[model samples]
Target: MGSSHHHHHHSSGLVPRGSHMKGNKEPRNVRLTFADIELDEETHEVWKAGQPVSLSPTEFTLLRYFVINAGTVLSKPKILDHVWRYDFGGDVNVVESYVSYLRRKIDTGEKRLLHTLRGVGYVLREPR
Candidate 1:
C-alpha cells in the first residue's frame, strides 16, 4: 500500500471531514416585511413592489434598523447610540444624511415608508 494510504488509515480514527458534527448549525434566513417591501437578511437584498431596490451597506443597516423599529420615533442620539453604536462620530446630521439617502432609495419610487419629525427625529411606518 502507498504511504498515503497508510496516512488515511491513521486519520480514520478521527472524525471524517465534512461529517455533520454536533453544534454545527446554520442561521435561518430572515425577511423583514413592511407593507410590500421585503428585506432579505441573508442576502442583504431589498425588494419593493416586486422590484429590487439597491442599498449601500450603511443604508441597508439603517433600513434594517427602521424595519425592526417601525412606527417608533428614532431620535438622532438614539440612532447613533444604537445604529452606529457610538463608533461613528459627528453630529446628528449623520443620521439626517443617511436617512435622506435611505429615503431616496427605499422610499422614492412609490409609497413612502420613512418620515422626518422635524425638531424631534425620524420614523418609519406603513402608510395609513
Candidate 2:
C-alpha cells in the first residue's frame, strides 16, 4: 500500500509461505477497485461489481505477480523470469499475450493495475 513515488517495504519480496510458515507471518490482502471490479488477496479471489471473477492458471499467475510487486515497474523479462521459469523456454509473445489476457478479464476494461510503462515496464498500482 504505497504510491509509486515512495516505497515502504513490508516483508521479504519472496514467494509467500507456499508450504511452511515462520512466526505470525500472515499474508497481506490487496484491495482493488475500478469501475465495477474488486478483489481481495487474502481470500485469493476476484470479483467484478459483485460477481466472482474466475481466473485461469495463466491469469492467476499474472495477477499474483502484480500483487507481489504492487505499485512499481515490472519488466517483461522480470515477469517471464518468475511466471515462466527460465528453464521453461517459450516465445516472448507468451508474456505479452498473457498480460493482455489478464488485463482484458480482470481489469473490467480499465487496465489500471497492470499498466504498460512504455520503454520502461509494467506496474501494479493499488486503487486510488
Candidate 3:
C-alpha cells in the first residue's frame, strides 16, 4: 500500500517557432488581360485575338505596364519612369516611339485599344 504511482501532467505547451515558415508560398502565375490582349507574367507571353503576338523586350515591358493600368491615362514621364525605370536619360519621345510600336502590334484589329490625348497622355481602353 506504500507504493502509490503518481501521474505527471504533460502540458509543456511550447509551439515550435517558424513551423509555418515553409507554408508561405507566393502565387505561381499572374496573367493580365485587357480587351482581346492577354499578358502572361510567368511565361512573358502576349496574345491578341486569341493569337500569339511577338513583342520586343522593351515592347513587352511597356505593354505589361499599360495592360496592368488599362483604362488610365499614362503620361510620357510616368511611362518612362515605370517602363524605362529612369535608366533612359533620353527625351520622352522614346515613349512615343514605343507606344507607336505597341499600338501597331496590339491595336491592329478593327477595335482600337490605345488612344492618345494630344498633350495630355495615352490611355489603353476599349473603343467607345
**How big is the positional error of residue 23 in model 2, measured in Å on the Cα after superposition?**
13
TM-score versus the correct structure, for each prediction:
0.68, 0.57, 0.71
Candidate 2's C-alpha lDDT? 0.67
Arrange candidates by TM-score, highest first: which order?
3, 1, 2
Residue range 36-79, candidate 3, lDDT tens digits: 87888778888888779878777888888787788889888878
Candidate 1 — which pairs collide?
A: none
Question: What is the Cα-based TM-score of model 1?
Answer: 0.68
Winner by TM-score between candidate 3 and candidate 1: 3
Pairs in clash, predicted candidate 3: none
Q: After superposition, how far is residue 22 of candidate 2 from its true place, in Å?
A: 20
Off by over 4 Å in 3: 1-28
- Scored by lDDT, the top model is 3
Per-residue lDDT of model 1, residues 1-128, tens digit only: 45565453465556657577665455566778888778987898988887797787767787778878889998888877787763667577777777676666665655666777888888887678
Candidate achieving higher lDDT, 1 or 2: 1
If both were scored by lDDT, which would come out higher, candidate 1 or candidate 3? 3
